[PDB]
Amino acid sequence: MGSMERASLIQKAKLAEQAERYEDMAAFMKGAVEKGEELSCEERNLLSVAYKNVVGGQRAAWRVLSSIEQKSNEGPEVREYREKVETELQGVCDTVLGLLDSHLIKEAGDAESRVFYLKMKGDYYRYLAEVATGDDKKRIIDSARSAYQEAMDISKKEMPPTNPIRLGLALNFSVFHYEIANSPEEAISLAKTTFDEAMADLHTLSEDSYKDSTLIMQLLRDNLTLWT
């Protein structure tokens, strides 16, 4: 996307989201990132929404195919096609991780940008961990954990307990604990403490901020209900 203006890439990313063309949206936002300038709050959201949708479709397909593959092991085609989807998913995760590493994270100094990008880093290593089975599942899990932990440490120091980025980070780290790290007690403890500390901070918020925070707190509650 080197020949397109940064502002045109952003505008077309918004159009692609309206058209539910998330592959296009991601390519436009990748081009915007590669312009080398930092991203605004809105632009960070566009980047995240685009790749979240793309990899979300790949994860859903991988789970369908992995389930069929396991039912068959109780020709090579099911395995081959699951492998193809898995390779494409890993390529998307690697692309996002490459954008964070070159050079979004190192230029992100404010808590809102740095925590957001590090949560992203944890998320895309978590997606890699979901399909990892070889000599590097452990290293991938530790890469996810390390990114989440750095984001957690910054968010505790720099953000109020109701901050939506802080809440969504804790939500996803708790999912990491439950689904990836085989630590359901840590997952439940994190979700509970996150919810309770946000509840106690709600009195400080405007009507609109209250709606933003309580919406995410409900997602923590839904998980706790499923886990207990």
Partner: peptide, 9 residues
């Protein structure tokens, strides 16, 4: 178990 939906912008 639900992660944060990066559904809409």
């Amino acid at each position: 178990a639900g992660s944060i939906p990066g559904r809409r912008s």
